[PDB]
């Protein structure tokens, strides 16, 4: 899908509580990605169980779903060339301990259960999570004036 | 009322296009205010005309309304003591020329017809603007861990 | 006297707790002031009522002493031309509501009882506060390479 | 001349030595002004005597000219609506002591003889200083892609 | 050779348009390198074709050359120990996708055909590129006060 | 042990002199580590050769001791899960040439003898260095409100 690829990102409850929302948004803005959906939300455990359905057998599954519902998250959709892969690169490893300085988690986090943010792991997960969290009318198309200075 | 006062803020289309959303959000976060609503919307002229109803007869009203409808805006509700009056101070004068460095308009723009942000001018205006832009179930109540170090 | 004037500054418990120590220090560093003493302490109530002796008969005095004692404070001494008066300008007005953006309290604080920093109000108060918080041996003399570019 | 107004700015030798060139440039970029000339230069005392000709009777004139020639300056031309007036607002008062936090001098400087930067005091001085420091071919015209988000 | 090694750097037209000049300059300043030449130029295709002579037969050569000529570039010479190799590390991989967060390309862009900066690839290349872009009298020798705290 | 592991960090004389203390502190603060001791000192040569005891027979040992004694150092103790190993990752490789951008030395330093910071290399070295630089009464215990958002 080229430069029209989209990913689902969410600032987790710890990110909101630590006042790192603007700090997170800025990292993706300064990179050149296009913000196309944004929402402050109180995620229900039902949505979170489906969001993390792949992890249902894991010992930390219950804790994860409860933590993600214990406070507001900032749900987001970002657009650009390799946005899924590259957003993951900017996030850093799942475990902050393996994430180098320079990444969100390397700069801001200690522990895997309190990493600040979610990013889709693949284009298939992205497509699944976009539809899960957002309605079609919540996804905005806009002509970026500086697009020519990011692409070609 | 009190620490429970709320204000309506909006990053205008130039804020999104100039990649200043994270920059704007960060400044209210670090000030100590609570983010209680957030969404990226593409506003109709109809909404904006109601939003700026009092400016109906102004020579610049057409330009304002079109400009606000020209791109996505980030709609926000912030909560805290004296948040309406204080957010306006953070934003700076309507004309960025009269807005001192240190303010959002002082640091980040030039002209009155492109001043990167809207803020409610009073508690009564905030009350009308919140209801106009948000459904009541888009306004989130959450226990902020940071209020302990901001309030007596 | 002159370029060798000194002030006492302290990051209050809310400053440490909100992780704003580095931020505060950076602002005095980038200004070109010379750091001559620095220390993390749990100041005893006995020390704090002598520090705030002049506010004895104020209603808030009691809970101001108890608060400043309720956590670690970063005590420091800064040196430079007009440091006392210039520090207070940088810190901002006592009530953060009166403190403009660009100042520490204008950027970071909401309420008077949680204004993340103390600064000596006069040259004479500075001499007194410096002597009360530090021993003579804690105040360091060091050749300031940067001085040749900050002074005529 | 509207949005086509230009001003001459120079990072003084102290600004270069303190590594504040990028920091200075950033303040004018983030404001929305257009950089149209840029040059690292070793200013001769002959050029500096003419640059500051208005000050020839002043007791500090010799010292000023010698300081300005003791190291490289970053000579610049910036363009935009009220760029002369507004650049001065961003610089802050001549004497750093009268310049509030938020301005270059308020944030970064102590003493009048070591203020970090020069800005034209008027459009007439701007026109004089542009021609003094730059040849016509050193002034570049470029179409700013985000111009529509700064003007109208 | 030694601390006297020099490299040619250029902020490409996208760096100027995305207002990242001050951001780029700040990163070499804070690393400890000495700025010895600086100018904003509008490069001819002829200069750029010589600059990228080795890429003459590449399928993207036309696009590169036109893009580089499409807007003003900031030409620079930086000086310091291992400055060529180290600047390249600061810049990051040619393709911004392979450039880790923390690098200029890692933080600030997406695509290989719009990577905001050029850096010499070797001491021999730097020598050719400096002579190509600068006259010898545009290269400044100045006694840096900061070298004392960067070098043994 | 665990979340209560502690490391010793020191801003070396070049760190203080280059006004990078606030910068360094901020980076450990934003990471979520807890500051438990802090102090500006002129460390005696006798202390420094016992601190660097293990490097006795190294050629540089002599001038390393004398350098670290030639100016004020900011001694500190930080606390958190895996703080020792994570601090060293944040600081970067001993030779800044091997230290990637995003790390402290990768961002700020050029040469091995002027790498602006020391950090304990192991848990056992930390216990030893902490005890050597601080008295038991200088290491503070305080309730970390932020901990509930950094740990599971
Ligand atoms: N071992 C664990 N203990 C507690 N929480 C975990 C653990 N592993 C993962 N998590 C949480 O669950 C989220 C989803 O895990 P996973 O899908 O493996 O990683 P990612 O978010 O990188 O795709 C993580 O981002 C993290 O917040
Ligand atoms: N004279 C003008 N010319 C063009 N646009 C204007 C003018 N005055 C105001 N505006 C636009 O209309 C908005 C609303 O105006 P107003 O309510 O007076 O200011 P504020 O938003 O600061 O309360 C302003 O923020 C600005 O975007
Ligand atoms: N009305 C008040 N209520 C609560 N605390 C106050 C009040 N006024 C002052 N304080 C506290 O007492 C401290 C010292 O008071 P004062 O000397 O008046 O201000 P400053 O610290 O700006 O010099 C202030 O920093 C503030 O935290
Ligand atoms: N009293 C003084 N002593 C030393 N240097 C001064 C003094 N006054 C001004 N200067 C230097 O001379 C420059 C030019 O002075 P002036 O034209 O009055 O101010 P400005 O630069 O604000 O236009 C100042 O920016 C400053 O660097
Ligand atoms: N495959 C490509 N497609 C488009 N542009 C490219 C490609 N490879 C390189 N370029 C452009 O040409 C410039 C010079 O290429 P090269 O010398 O290989 O890299 P570097 O500039 O990192 O030394 C690159 O910085 C980039 O702007
Ligand atoms: N080859 C060298 N030349 C000069 N100084 C050195 C050299 N190697 C190490 N040092 C200095 O000695 C300090 C301690 O050395 P070491 O323990 O090897 O590194 P680190 O401090 O990263 O653990 C370093 O921080 C550095 O300043």
**Domains of chain B (ranges, CATH numbers):** 1-152 (3.30.70.141)
The answer to whether D102 contacts B97, with C-beta atoms less than 8 Å apart, is: no
Q: Is the Cβ–Cβ distance between D96 and D110 less than 8 Å?
A: yes
The answer to whether A146 contacts D146, with C-beta atoms less than 8 Å apart, is: yes
Declared resolution, Å? 2.3
Main-chain phi, psi angles of F19, to 5 degrees: 60, 45
Q: Which residues of A touch D145 (CB under 8 A)?
A: 145-146, 148-149
D105 C-beta neighbours (distance < 10 Å), count? 24
F95 is known to lie in a ligand binding site:
no
- Cα separation, B21 vs A22, in Å, equals 7
A47: left (phi over 0), alpha (psi -120 to 50) or beta: alpha
The answer to whether A39 contacts B40, with C-beta atoms less than 8 Å apart, is: yes
Structure tokens of B86? 């204080």
A149 shares contact with chain D (CB less than 8 Å): yes
Q: What is the DSSP letter of C116?
A: S
Nearest to E14 among A30, A103, A149 (CB): A149
- Cα separation, F43 vs E48, in Å, equals 54
The dihedral sign for the CA sequence E62, E67, E68, E69: positive
Which residues numbered 107-146 in B keep a CB inside 8 Å of some CB on F? 145
| CA-derived radius of gyration, chain D | 15
- Cα separation, F127 vs B150, in Å, equals 35
Q: Which strands form C117-119's sheet, in the order they lie side by side?
A: C117-119, C6-11, C73-79, C34-41, F34-41, F73-79, F6-11, F117-119
Q: Which run of H or of E encompasses F57?
A: none
Ligand 3 atom at minimum distance from C52 CA: 14
Method: X-ray
Catalytic residues of B, which ones?
118
Ligand 6 atom at minimum distance from F117 CA: 25
- Cα separation, E134 vs E78, in Å, equals 13
Structure tokens of C131? 């002597």
Q: Which strands form B34-41's sheet, in the order they lie side by side?
A: A117-119, A6-11, A73-79, A34-41, B34-41, B73-79, B6-11, B117-119
Q: Which run of H or of E encompasses C8?
A: strand C6-11
Q: Is the Cβ–Cβ distance between B67 and B15 less than 8 Å?
A: no
Interface test with F, best of B145, B147, B148, B151 (most F CBs within 10 A): B145
Q: Which has the closest alpha carbon to C32: C86, C109, C73, C104?
A: C86
The answer to whether E26 contacts D22, with C-beta atoms less than 8 Å apart, is: yes
| Nearest protein Cα to ligand 5, atom 15 | E94
Tell me how far the alpha carbon of residue D62 lies from the centroid of ligand 4, in angstroms: 12
- For chain F, counts of helices (H) and of strands (E): 8, 4
Q: Is F130 exposed, middle or buried (0-12, 13-18, 19+ CB in 10 A)?
A: buried
Which residue's entry shows tokens 């000030």? B31
- Cα separation, B37 vs B8, in Å, equals 9
Q: Which residues of E touch D144 (CB under 8 A)?
A: 17
The answer to whether C29 contacts F20, with C-beta atoms less than 8 Å apart, is: yes
Tell me how far the alpha carbon of residue C49 lies from the centroid of ligand 3, in angstroms: 13
Q: What is the DSSP letter of C146?
A: T
* Displacement of CA F80 from its chain's centroid (Å): 14
Distance from CA of E7 to the nearest CA of D (A): 16
Main-chain phi, psi angles of C10, to 5 degrees: -140, 130
Q: Encode chain D in three state secondary structure.
A: CHHHCEEEEEECHHHHHCCCHHHHHHHHHHHCCEEEEEEEECCCHHHHHHHCHHHCCCCCHHHHHHHHCCCCEEEEEEECCCHHHHHHHHHCCCCHHHCCECEHHHHHCCCHHHCCEEECCCHHHHHHHHHHHCCHHHCCCCCCCCHHHCCC
3-state class of E128 per DSSP?
A: helix
| CA-derived radius of gyration, chain E | 15
Q: Is the Cβ–Cβ distance between F105 and F18 less than 8 Å?
A: no
Q: Is the Cβ–Cβ distance between A21 and B29 less than 8 Å?
A: yes
Tell me how far the alpha carbon of residue F101 lies from the centroid of ligand 1, in angstroms: 27
A114, HSE (Cβ side, Cα atoms, 13 Å): 20
| Nearest protein Cα to ligand 2, atom 9 | B112
Q: How many residues does chain C have?
A: 152
Q: Could you give the C-alpha distances from C125 to C51, C105, D88, F16, F62, in angstroms and in order?
A: 9, 21, 35, 27, 44
Distance from CA of B55 to the nearest CA of A (A): 27
Which residues numbered 19-78 in F keep a CB inside 8 Å of some CB on A? 27, 30-33
The answer to whether B102 contacts C100, with C-beta atoms less than 8 Å apart, is: yes
Ligand 4 atom at minimum distance from D54 CA: 17
Q: What is the DSSP letter of F9?
A: E
Tell me the helix, strand and coil percentages in chain A, rounded to 5: 50, 15, 35
Q: Could you give the C-alpha distances from F123 to B130, C102, C146, F55, in angstroms and in order?
A: 53, 41, 36, 18
Q: Is the Cβ–Cβ distance between B6 and B87 less than 8 Å?
A: no
Tell me how far the alpha carbon of residue A26 lies from the centroid of ligand 5, in angstroms: 27
Q: How many residues does chain E have?
A: 152
Distance from CA of A84 to the nearest CA of F (A): 22
3-state class of E36 per DSSP?
A: strand
Closest residue, chain F, to C16 (C-alpha): F35
Q: Is the Cβ–Cβ distance between E77 and E139 less than 8 Å?
A: yes
The dihedral sign for the CA sequence E132, E133, E138, E140: negative
| Nearest protein Cα to ligand 5, atom 6 | E113
Q: Which residues of D touch E16 (CB under 8 A)?
A: 35, 142
Query: How many contacts (CB atoms, under 8 Å) link A and D?
Result: 8
E33: left (phi over 0), alpha (psi -120 to 50) or beta: beta
Q: Is the Cβ–Cβ distance between D130 and D123 less than 8 Å?
A: no
Helix extents (H) in chain B: 13-17, 21-29, 45-51, 61-68, 83-91, 104-108, 123-133
Distance from CA of A147 to the nearest CA of D (A): 9
The answer to whether A152 contacts E63, with C-beta atoms less than 8 Å apart, is: yes
Tell me how far the alpha carbon of residue F98 lies from the centroid of ligand 6, in angstroms: 13
CB of F60 sitting under 6 A from ligand 6: yes
Catalytic residues of D, which ones?
118
The answer for residues whose C-beta is within 8 angstroms of residue B46's C-beta and 6 or more apart is none
The answer for residues whose C-beta is within 8 angstroms of residue B49's C-beta and 6 or more apart is B56, B65
Q: Which run of H or of E encompasses A139?
A: none
């Amino acid at each position: 899908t080229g430069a029209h690829e989209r990913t689902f990102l969410a600032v987790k409850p710890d990110g909101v509580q630590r006042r790192l929302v603007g700090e997170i948004v800025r990292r993706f803005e300064r990179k050149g990605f296009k913000l196309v959906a944004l929402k402050l939300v109180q995620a229900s455990e039902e949505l979170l169980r489906e969001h993390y359905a792949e992890l249902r057998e894991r010992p930390f599954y219950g804790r994860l779903v409860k933590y993600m519902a214990s406070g507001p998250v900032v749900a987001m959709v970002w657009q650009g060339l390799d946005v899924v892969r590259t957003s993951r690169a900017l996030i850093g490893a799942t475990n902050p301990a393996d994430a180098p300085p320079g990444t969100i988690r390397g700069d801001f986090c200690i522990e895997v259960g309190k990493n600040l943010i979610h990013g889709s792991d693949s284009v298939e997960s992205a497509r699944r999570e976009i539809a899960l969290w957002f309605r079609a009318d919540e996804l905005l198309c806009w002509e970026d004036s500086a697009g020519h200075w990011l692409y070609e």
